[PDB]
Design a binder for this molecule. Structure first.
Ligand SMILES: O=C(O)c1ccccn1
Ligand SMILES: [Ca+2]
Lengths: 336, 336
């Protein structure tokens, strides 16, 4: 097999040894699998192109691949939200099940042909936190008029409640929050959020980030770059992505607990969103799916099967996984 | 003309097709990664050696690797329980986090090296069910004298409450339930149980299966066979295992819900173990760990750190992950 050299434009700061670290691991593994012959170099967000351009830069061949949240690019097609995740959507396990064994990947591949891309799921961050605020969120009144940084489809939901959302890139969130040009910000969770500093300027940390059931990460590959690879190199990339689909989330799961404990020790006020706020955003989410199905044939094509899959998945996880986890987590706490 | 040729002795009949199929996928991916030059052939349980001998067969070099449930070999060393999962143990995500980012893999590698093995995690079954019961379980009194097909660690815990674990060939479980020779049987979960029709002869299908936690699947590799591989072939095996750690579970997550629907349509009564029963089996499990730790320094050395990891994980998952999943699963049910 030949020597192949690619650039991977990520959307993340190097400081995030979780999500960026996973991109680096992916590249390293592809190298190992090919004796260094398939060399992919990852670049932090903003280095090669602004992260807002990471999809376009893959479609036009500027870079061979990226490492992104696909719904940053929601302005291209709202059906991209099936790739990243829907609000109150599938959890990480259920999402990977839908993708690989429920027909999701093939439906997304068809979508991505419109953009000269071959997509691969390559990570997940799980259920996100609800973000950082300067005041208590007691009711939906506290969301009306809020200038909030939020990535993904959740912005579209929150706009219905009067939030003014923006997908400001990660490295730019803290300076805006610090300056006060945004009032609130969500990123991912305790480990990453501590790295970026939001707790220094915002006292309240809410949970859960309903914004996605899980935030799944995608590597978009230029379709001509993909085609040019020999079969073993395609397999290397696929397997490395499948592996990071476990490993990235495993790193978050390992690292987040201590980070939260430290955030609380340092003064963060951690609270659940009130039930009434949860109900309001849930209802707004359901209204959004009705709208997107009516307006976007690509969303309409995927939604019904996706919805049936969620219904089946949720029913089963409620019976077994969650029956056990809810019991065990409480028993472990009592025993502590 | 392969460069390396290995045999993989699995513990499964091909009819356990989610698990055996994953072993096949693993071997196929390794072939893809190496243009067929690292050839691994999988074999069903018993074809090369009995499944009970799969660990020793690898230790002795009879075969290069296996595909097994490590708790089958707890008679050799009870610390192997940490590889597969403890009763009321980690969930699948938490186990993979412990293994890859929490120090678990290194602790298990040190244990396995003494048996001439390099171990890799390569799958997870997810939470299984509590089994098929002819009669309702209302309290721990109903466990005393219960003749239940169950083994391993679950049997050891339940025996403390007066259950009499039963050993019976797989094809004899259905007729044994039909005749009332046994009162109850655990097999696996909906996908596999559906093929055997236990619902037709023992309608109460109890949840959750706490017995095995979220059982992880291991490939034990002979250490000299492992060391003899070219590094790209080591990486191929590692990556294929990391990938199957996601894919096997994804396939069970996709498959189990349809099977559960079929079981319910055949008369399965999904039932939940009462709180009093759950508390009693949790307590009995903790007594077992105390005893295993007192008897085996290898178990004692791992347990406290594993327990702390579980406490840390449970504390964090309660904040966001389970907060959202519990909300969503309930909402999805209402909308359906
Ligand atoms: O832009 C975001 O909000 C983001 C990106 C990656 C993962 C989760 N969230
Ligand atoms: Ca986010």
């Amino acid at each position: 097999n030949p020597t192949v050299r690619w650039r991977m434009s990520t959307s993340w700061p190097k400081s995030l040894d979780t999500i960026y670290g996973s991109a680096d691991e992916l590249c390293k593994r592809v190298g190992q699998l090919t004796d260094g012959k398939f060399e992919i170099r990852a670049f932090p967000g903003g280095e090669l192109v602004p992260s807002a351009q990471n999809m376009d830069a893959v479609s036009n061949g500027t870079v061979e691949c990226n490492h992104v949240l696909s719904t940053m690019y929601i302005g291209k097609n709202t059906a991209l939200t099936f790739d990243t995740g829907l609000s109150f959507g599938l959890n990480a396990r259920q999402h990977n099940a839908w993708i690989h064994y429920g027909g999701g990947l093939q439906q997304l591949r068809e979508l991505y042909k419109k953009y000269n891309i071959v997509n691969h799921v390559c990570g997940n961050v799980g259920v996100q936190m609800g973000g950082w605020y300067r005041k208590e969120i007691k009711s939906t009144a506290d969301l009306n008029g809020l200038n909030m940084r939020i990535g993904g489809i959740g912005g579209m939901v929150l706009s219905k409640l009067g939030v003014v959302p923006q997908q400001i890139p990660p490295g730019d969130i803290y300076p805006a929050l610090e300056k006060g040009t945004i009032d609130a910000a969500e990123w991912i969770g305790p480990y990453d959020d501590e790295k970026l500093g939001f707790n220094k300027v915002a006292p309240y940390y809410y949970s859960p980030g309903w914004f996605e059931g899980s935030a799944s990460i995608t590597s978009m590959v230029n379709d001509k770059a993909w085609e040019a690879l020999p079969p073993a190199y395609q397999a290397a990339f696929e397997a490395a992505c499948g592996e990071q689909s476990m490993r990235m989330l495993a790193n978050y799961d390992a690292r987040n607990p201590l980070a939260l404990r430290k955030l609380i020790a340092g003064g963060a006020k951690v609270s659940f969103f009130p039930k009434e706020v949860m109900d309001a955003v849930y209802k707004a989410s359901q209204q959004l799916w009705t709208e997107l199905s009516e307006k976007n044939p690509d969303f309409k094509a995927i939604y019904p099967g996706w919805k049936k899959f969620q219904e089946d998945e949720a029913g089963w996880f409620r019976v077994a996984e969650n029956a056990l986890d809810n019991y065990t987590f409480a028993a472990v706490a009592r025993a502590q």
